[model samples]
Target: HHMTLTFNIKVIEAKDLPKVDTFGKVDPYVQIQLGNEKCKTKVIKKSYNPVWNETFSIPVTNPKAPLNITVVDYDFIGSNDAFAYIHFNQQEFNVGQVVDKWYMLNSYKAGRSAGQIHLVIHLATQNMKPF
Candidate 1:
């Protein structure tokens, strides 16, 4: 007997990012990781704050898996840069319930004022039409 889990996630936005470049701005975006899959948000240029309105979902095969979220700065001429990131247990949120809030991002001193990521997460059960 087996049951499957599905997740609905939204990467809303980030606020209060410290100026991290010589130009006094960061082209910011988001990266999301669940299980072993990954997704990304669009980039905003020359802004200390950015909103993605990025949304995605997937089925979870591993229970109590942690979600990996990273905030990276979009570099126009070079490789993209990471300013902050965090990990948390996605299963901690009650099933069928929704969580929408801000989480403080952990990272190096360059991102001291890097602020938090706004995420909305919800869960559901799958494999209902069993064989």
Candidate 2:
């Protein structure tokens, strides 16, 4: 039918974040995901309270599909770790509409936070057959 399902994600900034590195400061970044689609931000070196006025979009292919977001630390030699994450309900917005707002980063700890991400849920169904 050539119908396209898309979702939008705008990552703003973060504040009062927990430290992920012990040797020094954490090099933080963001990981935005939808189904199998994913994207990330550049590492903010040693700044716990990072300001990322960046945006990302996840083009979903299914209806009512959920999305996820997380704050991560990028290491040059070590394994990068996640500090927080949040789950979003895809059905939270109306088709062809946008709901922009701020959300606290769930530290995702042992499994949680309060940090940054802008949500823009623009839904649309295109290229359907004419009845």
Q: Model 2: which residue pairs collide?
A: 105-113, 105-115, 106-112, 106-113, 107-112, 107-113, 108-111, 108-112, 109-112
Number of the top-ranking candidate, with lDDT as the measure: 1
Tens digits of lDDT, candidate 1, 30-57: 8877777778888988776788877776
Candidate 2, poorest ten consecutive residues by summed lDDT = 122-131
Candidate 2 error regions (>4 Å) = 1-3, 20-23, 110-113, 116-121, 124-131
Taken over the whole model, the C-alpha lDDT of each candidate is: 0.75, 0.67
Residue-wise lDDT of candidate 2 within 1-131, one digit each (tens)? 43466555556677777765445577888887777777888788888778777755456665555677778878888788777778877767676676667677676554324455555455555542211
Give the TM-score comparing model 2 with the true structure, all chains together. 0.76
lDDT of 2 at 32: 76
Pairs in clash, predicted candidate 1: none
Tell me, what's the RMSD of every candidate? 4.4, 4.9
Model 1 bad stretches (over 4 Å)? 1-3, 21-24, 127-131
The top-ranked prediction according to TM-score is 1
